[PDB]
Amino acid sequence: PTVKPPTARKFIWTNHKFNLSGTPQQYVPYSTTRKKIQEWVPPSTPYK
Amino acid sequence: LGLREIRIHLCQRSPGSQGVRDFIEKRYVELKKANPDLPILIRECSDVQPKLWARYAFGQEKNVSLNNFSADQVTRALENVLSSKA
Amino acid sequence: TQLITVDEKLDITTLTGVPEEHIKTRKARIFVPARNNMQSGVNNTKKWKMEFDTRERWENPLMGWASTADPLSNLVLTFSTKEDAIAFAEKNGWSYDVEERKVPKPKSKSYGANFSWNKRTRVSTK
Amino acid sequence: TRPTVRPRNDVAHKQLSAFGEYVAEILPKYVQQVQVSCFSELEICIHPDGVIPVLTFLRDHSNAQFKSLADLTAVDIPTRQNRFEIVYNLLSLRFNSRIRVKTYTDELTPVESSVSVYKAANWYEREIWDMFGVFFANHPDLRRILTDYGFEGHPFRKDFPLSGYVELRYDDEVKRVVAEPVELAQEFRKFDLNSPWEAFPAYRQPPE
Amino acid sequence: TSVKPIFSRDMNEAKRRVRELYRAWYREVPNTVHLFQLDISVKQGRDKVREMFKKNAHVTDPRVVDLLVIKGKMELEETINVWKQRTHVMRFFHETEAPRPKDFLSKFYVGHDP
Amino acid sequence: GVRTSPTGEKVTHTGQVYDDEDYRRVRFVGRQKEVNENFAIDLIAEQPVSQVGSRVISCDGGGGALGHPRVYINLDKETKTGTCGYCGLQFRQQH
Amino acid sequence: SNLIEVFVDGQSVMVEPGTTVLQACEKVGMQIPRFCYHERLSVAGNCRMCLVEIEKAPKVVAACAMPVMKGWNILTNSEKTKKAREGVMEFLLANHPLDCPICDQGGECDLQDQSMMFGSDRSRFLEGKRAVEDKNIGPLVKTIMTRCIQCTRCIRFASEIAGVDDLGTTGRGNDMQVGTYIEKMFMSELSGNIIDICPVGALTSKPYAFTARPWETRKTESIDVMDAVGSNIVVSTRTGEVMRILPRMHEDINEEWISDKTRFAYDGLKRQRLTEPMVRNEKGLLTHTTWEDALSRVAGMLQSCQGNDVAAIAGGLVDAEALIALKDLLNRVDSDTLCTEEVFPTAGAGTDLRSNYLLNTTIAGVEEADVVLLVGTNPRFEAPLFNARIRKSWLHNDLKVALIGSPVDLTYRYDHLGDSPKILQDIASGSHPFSQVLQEAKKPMVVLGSSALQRNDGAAILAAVSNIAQKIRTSSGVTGDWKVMNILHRIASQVAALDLGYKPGVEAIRKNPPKMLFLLGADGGCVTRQDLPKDCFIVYQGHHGDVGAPIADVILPGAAYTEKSATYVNTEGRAQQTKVAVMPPGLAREDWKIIRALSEIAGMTLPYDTLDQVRNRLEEVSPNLVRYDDVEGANYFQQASELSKLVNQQLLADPLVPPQLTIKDFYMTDSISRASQTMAKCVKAVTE
């Protein structure tokens, strides 16, 4: 790469990181979708 | 305590319901003129046997087969239901 | 002669190894699949399909995936005629329902009807 | 049709048709159909009761000499009453040829075992049992060969689901590997990939 | 309606074979309990054998009961020789799974399963 | 252009966040929630609209075979720009 | 017979005179490729894909428009037929944009499938493609006119079936574009069906946009409950979530079209749901609880009730199993006060005979009628597929239609007799010309809407219309197998409730108010807490909390129509069953299961535990509810006519006005549509 540098991009990481397994900075999976079924909210006033 | 509804099941094309059919165009209307507050549901189907369901108070139901009955037998059975009130 | 007579109905449910829960509590639907309305092809409506009812699919707590506990969810069987499907359902002891095949009625098409003299079937544009 | 189309072998087609007529003429008691495919493969569909003589003929006739048993297969087609189709593939080294013999059985009819003709079938058809429940009469040692020891049901039947009915996990309370009903974290996504337009006009079936 | 029999021409020979298979399993059960070091008693194993035999006791076709006797014989030979482990013998005793609801109300409470 | 939920959790580009009463947040205790800080919509919003002098324009994303399939965009509407369906680039007719 | 003999690939086949080549090939079993042909539209013959070769004829003919001649040999697999198909595919794909990954028609595109089957495999087009400006026709149909192939199914559908005449081809040559030419939206009650008939991805469903893909969706065949037509639909789901709704082919009801509410109520089906049982706490607010506590509270309240102290109101989206379970539960207490929100006149024959509350002919009988009279209804919005059938018979069979009521737009020309009910009294007396028109009709048809029976003088209207039907039935030229008296319903659960013996209307409850009320999805607001006594124990059981939920004491979350196998009866008496597409969300259960568990808690157990046992009970009450896709004939019109002459009621002076006058009031009718964002967008786009 000193002879042929890579193409510069605005989103390419400027700080490479090694493997983070076993560390607090590891990766935890989760669902990226939102809620599917909306639940009905009962009214806050009594029927009286 | 008393009957609450009457159901008459029959067929439009089967011959065994014919006497039951002979009831409906002959003695039904005056019957409806005798018990105006009694639901008498007439239901037809493609191949059902003739039948008479009688619902009483608190869900008790009795069944009377009307197969190959004449019109006079049909109204005799119907008067038995109307005068039973069991 | 080496042949014996058995007149009882076929019943192989004890040999298939399927648990009884998926034998007596399942409803098998035998049907000709409907044509997809987004296409005009009719090649998918030539054979009878037998399938089962749909049970519960819920969400995985980890990734939100579709988890199930029904093993017969992806089972679809293909039969040439209705009677083969009925015989296969009765042999395996599955309670079944069958719906008749719906074919399109033959229409009457005429290109000249777009240019009628006194009928309402004139086209406003072509 | 030169570069991208597979060339035909007409002489092999003629020879296989002649030999099929020869076999169907020698044994009219058992054979039911003789066909040759477009890529020159000979299939002889016979009655199941002649599964022992016919193979023996193909093992011993001087014009056949099908000494090798290449394969033994069962095919499950639920739309037929005889849902199991049993396929024997034979190879003749003397004449450098291959033949296929097909019989039909259902779940309850037993089959005469072809161990006395070909010894390799002693495992092959046994596997068929372990995958299909097709009983082979007069087999020396018939049992399961691929499934687990407590396995119930025959997996290669088309009414058997992809995942089974049980699955294994280790339980620390009983200190044992135990079986429980299957609960998949991801359901197997079934894909309907069949196009609604007819692809091959030559294989079009007559209507009803 | 004439079919090729497997072993028995009628129901009598099939019932005879069922009797032999039950006799062999009843003789086998104490040896299975002692050899595999199971935590069950001989009474529990014999009651389990009787439970399977009564569970599979509503058939009337000679070929079906013939195949059932054949499969029971295969399981018996898998138990006679040490091919099954402790786990395969204890597959018949479902201890780990929770007992499923039976009445309408509990099945209504737990989910949508009929 | 990331934002921070009042519970202290980062919101992803899909809008996903865990509620305060959700127990699944216990999977992030002692670890970190992995989010991408480069939002594609924000990054494509900064791209200037290219002015061209033709009725239709062709887009392939640049690089030829390294881009998307080539598409043709009509620029007759003077009110709004013509956005590419793949790359999101927009064009405008200068007349 | 007058059949002629033609040949397809050397195989002989008899056809009727006037049959096209395409229809003969379909008869022998061969599907000729097509783009512009549609069996429910007029023949255009412009796509030129159906070009086939007749033997000993040196010119290919368009099979979609060419009538067969005697002795013609059709060669569907010949060399020049395949050459013509390849050339037409090349011309069609010359200007098509490379949009398949970003197009919703991918995986179910007709153009893709016929390009794979009958087309070539490479392109010779080295020039530049055209680009078409996109159009806007409303928030229902997403429009990408660059993908259009100018097949002109748009204009044919909008002119022959929808009856709108707002689409057209503007321009000439390669610049010809399909559109409205102005900033106009295509808002009809059957607009979304164009998304079904576009063979390319030019017109797509805007709510469905970029959500799923056809190969990964599971199809469940179910029945629509948005109206009383009973349209057969396919629910396409994906991983336990409903994605879209498509029509099903059924030649007797909804041939291949559905209304827009049916196609776009699913997004409201997945909103504002009831998931857990709720009870009133010490503060008077509805808080979540278990099934045991709520069912114990309801059973403890019901056990103290007897006689007429407990009643029930059935909603519009209730299955027959729930209705019979609630009827048996209330009859175990000896309560006959089971009511429905929709009002039907019970005077005279009542719900005894099935002839006087059914569409007695068929849906398809409009194709056989010659004079149709519509009384006090707007069939365009109350039952849009019935209006489509009437329009089809008007276009093809030269039907004559007259209407009594408000002069609504019905997408065909009719004879507006007036809006007063008194003109009906003129029809039976013969003082009107339309009395002579009905007398001279061979197959007359009188349709009375169920919305006209909601008035206080509904019994008098029904008596007058039945008098007209019996006057023009026995005296005029009616064969006897033809049924004249027809009632069009607008509620999916009304016919099944009337078959089971429910009391129509809520007047029985207003007569003597009960101290405990059951609301089986009663979101119509017919009975409020003002009419009920001071301490009324209202129990609500439904899938959506819209109107009846905030006034209830205990809320029992039920299942929707896509979440259970449920029996519904349409307006012509044909029983049908739905299938389980997805499962109910949260702790929501099936309705009859809820009622059976409630009877189990109270010690009054109903004698059924599984679904088939409830269906056997349904057969016991009325057998025609268990025969599916079968229309049992109704009889004894004369007996109902004789019974209707007993009690004389007078018509009111108010003119007949339907509740749905424009397309604005069509989109929101039930609780599912009122909780829908797509319906809100449609109403906003209409009103602006």
Ligand code: SF4
């Ligand atoms: S309409 Fe068909 S051919 Fe055109 S982009 Fe969509 S999938 Fe491709």
Ligand code: SF4
């Ligand atoms: S938009 Fe679709 S249906 Fe309309 S003319 Fe074009 S290809 Fe045909």
Ligand code: FES
């Ligand atoms: S289908 Fe005949 S020309 Fe289009």
Ligand SMILES: [K+]
């Ligand atoms: K489309």
Ligand SMILES: [Zn+2]
């Ligand atoms: Zn681009």
